[PDB]
Write a protein that binds this DNA or RNA. Structure first.
Lengths: 113, 123, 86
RNA sequence: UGAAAUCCCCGGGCUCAACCUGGGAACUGCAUCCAAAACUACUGAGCUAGAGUACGGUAGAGGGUGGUGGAAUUUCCUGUGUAGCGGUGAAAUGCGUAGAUAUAGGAAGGAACACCAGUGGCGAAGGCGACCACCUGGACUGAUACUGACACUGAGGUGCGAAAGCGUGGGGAGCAAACAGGAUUAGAUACCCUGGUAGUCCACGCCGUAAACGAUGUCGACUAGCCGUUGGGAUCCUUGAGAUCUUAGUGGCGCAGCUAACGCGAUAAGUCGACCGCCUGGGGAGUACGGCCGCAAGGUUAAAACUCAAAUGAAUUGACGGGGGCCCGCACAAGCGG
């Protein structure tokens, strides 16, 4: 009777990947490439790329190589996925629309001897 | 106010099965306090003896069936929206002593063609 | 409110002499008491604890009239034509 | 009637299988028509058990308007009088050619009503304490007579709402946000002292909030006992010094049951019912923006972005405390010495 006069409304769940609006990947251009420091238990010098996505959105993506060359105006593809240490990043630069290099041998996303 | 009288039967019964009270008296009404006849035909006997003239109080003679009573859970009533108006989709708990039915023609359970109402189980 | 006022408001609303309980008599016993209390609340306007006993008499009269109007409009029209109501 | 496909069960054809296909089932639905009359509708008449009326009788800080008291503080007059004000974690301001706490005295003025005072009472809540009168509300209580479901709840709405604030005008003892000093401390913007305007008080109007709490919505029915208490009533050999049952409140334990536990336990957090309000991880935030209200202070309705993997409840062990109680040791001071 209380349920009949207003029913139970379900709560919507927002995306935790706001940019790339329901897309798997979405390319942008690197605004700035830099390093920032992890959250309190961890310590490293981890390479980020602030990218301006082609939606007009402007997010920070992670570069998960063992050394990269995204040189300050590159044309990366990003994909979803948070990096728990870096506070306020939500994306990964995929490794293979620009550069892949190294040894990796325990691969993707990699190179192929 | 008091505005569901046969859930007041099934609660006066239940609270005295929860005590060890011998008899429950209550000022209840026609055929849906011959729910009491159904409940204590299929089940047991009582005297059950609706007995006055102008305040006709019925007196279930509960009995205690060895050790701990046989009414474990009764109520399951409808009053608004709490409800059974079924067409057989009605209770089958153990398939036993099933569910008093309270509608248009005669209070029974599970024997004739169909047509549900409401009550609730012996066990 | 008085003993002899309340006996005389019974006396011209009786309807079968032993009666003091019909919604004729009760609405008349209330309507008289509401009117006589209106003298009190012009003089005593800060008395809120006794306004509430008056608003109870207004609401007890409105329920009794809605009872009688839905039940017998001929007794309702006569009662409302007495008592100066509506 | 619910197209066919699909889905489903049984088959047939693809070399098997996808896939293709036959037949069935299903499509929980809809409308029409015929029957039944346990029940929540409706219509007609009833009944008295819910609810209300008349009639006594008590109890009450229920409310409102006036008045009268008594104790104390302060401030004023006049008298008697002589050095002061050894608060406290410690001293600093008002006093003597102006008499100093002050008399056995008088007058004025506000404001609060000791004792009674009580897990007491009344009120819907907020609240209400002197006494008397007047005006008035509801309960409780006893029999009897009457009405005959007249009831319950309640989104909207509309009233009433501690304090403090706010206009507008009286009032102004005492107390006292602000503030002045005086202390205390690294500082002290505070806790302590001496003052002290708003405010507190009265009238009318506004606000509309509180840890507005029993952190527990209202109504109704049922479910072991024992011990108090308030207002009634009835029975008891009856002196009551009383006793018992019965009601409506207010408390202390506690069986069943429930509870995460604490605990609740006829004043349920048990057992059920009717209706309403509300909640959906923590922050952001009861916040922005809008609307409504307010004279203002602001209230009420009320989010998102972003952020974090937690916050949270209750109990347990420990450690700790400028918590408490017991206990001990040249720990405390007797006839030692840098």
């Amino acid at each position: 009777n209380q349920l009949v006069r207003k029913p139970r409304k379900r709560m919507v769940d927002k995306s935790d990947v706001p940019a790339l609006q329901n897309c798997p990947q979405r390319r942008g251009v690197c605004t700035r490439v830099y390093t920032t420091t992890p959250k309190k238990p961890n310590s490293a010098l981890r390479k980020v790329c602030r990218v301006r996505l082609t939606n007009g959105f402007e997010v920070s993506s992670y570069i998960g190589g063992e050394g990269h060359n995204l040189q300050e105006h590159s044309v990366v593809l990003i994909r979803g996925g948070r990096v728990k240490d870096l506070p306020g990043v939500r994306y990964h630069t995929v490794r293979g629309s620009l550069d892949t290099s190294g040894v990796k041998d325990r691969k993707q996303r990699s190179k192929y001897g | 106010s008091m505005q569901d009288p046969l859930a007041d039967m099934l609660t006066r019964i239940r609270n005295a099965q929860m005590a060890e009270k011998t008899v429950v008296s209550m000022p209840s009404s026609k055929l849906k306090a011959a729910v009491a006849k159904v409940l204590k035909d299929e089940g047991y006997i009582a005297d059950f003896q609706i007995s006055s003239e102008v305040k006709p109080q019925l007196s279930i003679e509960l009995k205690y069936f060895e050790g701990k009573p046989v009414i474990e859970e009764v109520k399951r009533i409808s009053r608004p929206g709490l409800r059974q108006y079924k067409s057989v989709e009605q209770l089958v708990r153990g398939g036993l002593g099933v569910s008093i039915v309270s509608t248009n023609k005669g209070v029974m359970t599970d024997r004739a063609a169909r047509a549900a109402g409401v009550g609730g189980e012996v066990v | 409110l008085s003993v002899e006022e309340k006996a005389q408001i019974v006396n011209e609303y009786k309807q079968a002499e032993g009666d003091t309980g019909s919604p004729e008599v009760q609405v008349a016993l209330l309507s008289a008491n509401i009117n006589k209390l209106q003298d009190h609340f012009k003089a005593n306007g800060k008395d809120h604890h006794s306004r509430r006993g008056l608003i109870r008499m207004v609401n007890q009269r409105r329920k009794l009239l809605d009872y009688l109007k839905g039940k017998d409009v001929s007794r309702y029209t006569a009662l409302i034509g007495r008592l100066g109501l509506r």
